């Protein structure tokens, strides 16, 4: 859950940079659509003709959301792995806490109608 063996300064840990990063993911494309959407409504608030065909500062709007979104997804791929890693290590160390139950054909009540 909470942070234990992790410190601040530089958002990814770099020591645990083993997992592969997101390459051409559908999650990157949707933020890329939002980067395009931010480059559509800027010509709506500041009065500029045609949201699709206007000024080409939209390339900055696409790149910025992709750039920030890539490192944000890199933080997502890191933190979900660490949370899973500390969960698996807790079961392997204690063993007594997590109990296993197998093979059962227990009788249950049957409902009418």
């Amino acid at each position: 859950g909470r942070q234990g063996r992790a410190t601040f300064q530089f958002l990814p840990d770099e020591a645990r940079s083993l997992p592969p990063p997101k390459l051409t993911d559908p999650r990157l494309a949707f933020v890329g659509f939002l980067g395009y959407c931010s480059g559509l409504i800027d010509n709506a608030i500041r009065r500029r003709p045609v949201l699709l065909a206007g000024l080409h500062r939209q390339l900055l709007y696409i790149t910025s959301f992709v750039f920030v979104g890539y490192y944000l997804l890199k933080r997502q791929d890191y933190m979900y792995a660490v949370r899973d890693h500390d969960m698996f290590s807790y079961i392997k160390s204690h063993x007594x806490x997590x109990x296993x139950x197998x093979x059962x054909x227990x009788x249950x009540x049957x409902x009418x109608x």
Partner: protein, 48 residues
């Protein structure tokens, strides 16, 4: 701390730390037990 102070020192907060010259704390010996007892997370969440 919400944001940690890495590669910089600005602490000097806890008792029985680095003395101004050599002057001791009134409860210096007792924190030599307390800090050494609770340096790990074992007695931080449970405190037993």
């Amino acid at each position: 701390q919400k944001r940690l102070g890495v590669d910089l020192d600005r602490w000097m907060t806890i008792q029985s730390a680095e003395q101004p010259h050599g002057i001791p704390s009134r409860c210096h010996a007792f924190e030599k037990e307390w800090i050494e007892c609770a340096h790990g997370i074992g007695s931080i969440r449970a405190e037993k």
